[PDB]
Symmetry: D2
Subunit: 250 residues, 4 copies
């Protein structure tokens, strides 16, 4: 069983790769930095069980993995872009293009590249990591929220056609997941350290804590196991009960 996890150093990246690996999958990993064989090797050394790739774009990643490791059973399209809090009139239209390109076109591209071998083998699983920002409660986050909703709708739409061919498709829409060293999107500093921040997580999520990489990885692994294919189409809000807003005063 062969898996690919994209952007392996951020967001849901590590939780996913590490848990799948433990589950017995051969896990190919992609990251922008794996461009420099510098960075690639310091990661092969640190994680002998994962197997990182240099390839960057969807089709060369899929061919590279198919060639080296057999055939992709599992795609985890762990998608990232920076989050800027501009209001609408202050963005460039091109900014939305780049945002959509990053969060919406990318997973289309990955799924479009993997789909026909999965369909031929009548087997595979496809998971997008999106965001609870879709139809969420934030302001001045317009580009990000819509692009992410794009990607979750893609996942649901795709399930509908691939179910014929035994291929479940899922979206995982997180908020407040511990990214650790990565800035995408809840790095320890300042999210564990800054008092103001620990107060914010405390006020607005219901479990009054950040989620964990391990939690995110366990779900990915559960979905990837073939244990619950009937859930196909589901958007999972991976968010600890966010949002919670206080009772009336007085």
């Amino acid at each position: 069983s062969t898996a690919i996890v994209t952007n392996v150093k951020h967001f849901g990246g590590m939780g996913s790769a590490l848990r799948l690996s433990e589950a017995g999958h051969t896990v190919a990993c992609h990251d922008e930095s794996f461009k420099h064989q510098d960075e690639l090797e310091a990661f092969a050394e640190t994680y002998p069980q994962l197997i990182p790739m240099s390839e960057q774009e969807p089709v060369e990643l899929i061919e590279a993995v198919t060639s080296a490791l057999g055939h992709v059973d599992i795609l985890v399209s762990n998608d990232i872009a920076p989050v800027e809090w501009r209001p609408i009139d202050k963005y460039a239209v091109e900014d939305y293009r780049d945002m959509v390109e990053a969060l919406q076109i990318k997973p289309f591209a990955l799924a479009n590249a993997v789909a026909s071998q999965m369909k031929r083998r009548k087997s595979g699983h496809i998971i997008f990591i999106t965001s609870a920002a879709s139809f969420g409660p934030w302001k001045e986050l317009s580009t990000y929220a819509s692009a992410r909703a794009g990607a979750s709708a893609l996942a649901n739409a795709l399930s509908k056609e691939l179910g014929e061919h035994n291929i479940p498709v899922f979206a995982i829409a997180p908020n407040g997941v511990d990214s650790g060293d990565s800035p995408y999107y809840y790095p320890s500093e300042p999210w564990k350290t800054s008092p103001e921040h620990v107060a914010w997580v405390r006020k607005y999520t219901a479990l009054q804590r950040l989620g964990t990489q391990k939690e995110l990885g366990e779900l990915v692994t559960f979905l990837a196991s073939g244990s619950c294919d009937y859930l196909t189409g589901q958007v999972f809000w991976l968010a600890g009960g966010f949002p919670v807003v206080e009772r009336w005063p007085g």
Copy 2:
């Protein structure tokens, strides 16, 4: 840990008990048939890893399990009631009351009975098994669809208050799960044999099969493992892609 699965013979019951058990939970099982000794012992003999309980009403069941076993960590409120397709004006009000009694009042009563215990220890898991009928595509299913939505909304709402106390709350909202010889809600006959049933499922569900007990058990067990408490509040659409509608002709 200790789980209670209600109406174990039906709907999501067997998948939940079998699979919980398989996962080393201690599983007490409620059923309307366990009110008779003979029905109970037969079950205990067929499924010696489960412990079937005789108690029927909510408060009585929870104390009984707390006695025999010390604490209830995992409540699976596996709620059932007969679906009949009638138009709104052919019902009587009390038919709706009854449906709300079985589908909505009942999970509230179990949750209510177990909560303090759970909150005291700042640990536990609560799972309601509702139905994909909630905001669903059916007609003349008005009492059932709405009662199920109330139960699902109740899960979501409880998850908000009970986060404070480290208590995950979920709803599993199924359609087309294989129910063995149970008429709730997709018994293998006619659903596995009769051609017009076989084709209806091929037509309206994405994966083009029924769901299995094992898939739903696997879900419950997962939610109750503590491996992913952070999904708290989730309403799970266990419906194999349902519904799909054909393109334009």
Copy 3:
């Protein structure tokens, strides 16, 4: 064209009755207080254009209206119950029964009582006023939120069967609508007066204001006009953008 509006003194009651009336409907009104012909008459005197009823329960209301005024074209099931912020283990099961009875069984009962004449005339409109508390962000509001979600699901389910017979069914799920004198659910005091309260509406809704009776009445009247029957099934969140939660700190 004949309309009935329930609990006419609270929640969406007045906005609805007054606007329908202006729209040219004969508006029968129900309120618990119309029990005492004391209260009934001081309301017929104050609103000569509305026509209040003494009848309390669904079937005697519908028969009474059908008999006096012709035939019910429009039902507005403006439903109310008190809101208590207990946690779950502190409620009596009977409390949920009373809550469900009030917010869920009542509109079932009203629609069940009106449905077959509307179906015979192949004409009518049915609107439940529910709440944005359904699947909403509050805590310790469990009974209320679920009962209200019950009632919105009813509305959506009912649309599906009555569309055959030319009958649109809608739910209107409000938050922060000015109730005025009524305590159900945003009376002027303290919602306009209390500083702490004006701050809360300001922080959590996006229009940073309470909604108005006039707004609520205009929507009801729009839905009741026969201008947009194709919307049938819709739950309208009548809530001014609630909830909004602040950006991260720092």
Copy 4:
């Protein structure tokens, strides 16, 4: 007040312009055909209460209307693109880019161009006409369904930030609205004549007819009247009950 309705000849266009106008708004109308003088004047002559504009691209259109008419109060982004049913692997990436360009980038561009003006005066209305396809029951509609969801999510999101400035934002998400001789998306032939089309609509929609231009115009006009700004953020499912699925056989 002054409204702009884009792609006026198609989809939600005519209902929106006609009905806005009927409501005393001043209505500037965009279309891809108005790039030709002859196509434009013909329209102006058929519909002398509308003012058709020649400008095509987002920034150019908004300044042109602001010139001729002084301010834009109401933006109706009536967005269109051809639906073709292909499986995911039969598309090329750039087909998805193009669909996102027309359905998602485009309303963003119009909203972006008009916003400051609107925010300055702390008044205005923004309406996106998307589609009920978003979380919909279709297959092989993957690019269209997802592009439309992004646009709907964009409406919701904008409504949050633009409340601050008294700006209501909505999405109208239709299915089965009569489009006259427009192929976007339910032209009267074959949808009013051909039996298999007539029956598909009778089968899957609750009200068992098409929606009318007038119903959608009525909606837009209402949203833009300021009579109910408090619905801001709403995604409107203008789909006549769709979808309904048959009971068990």
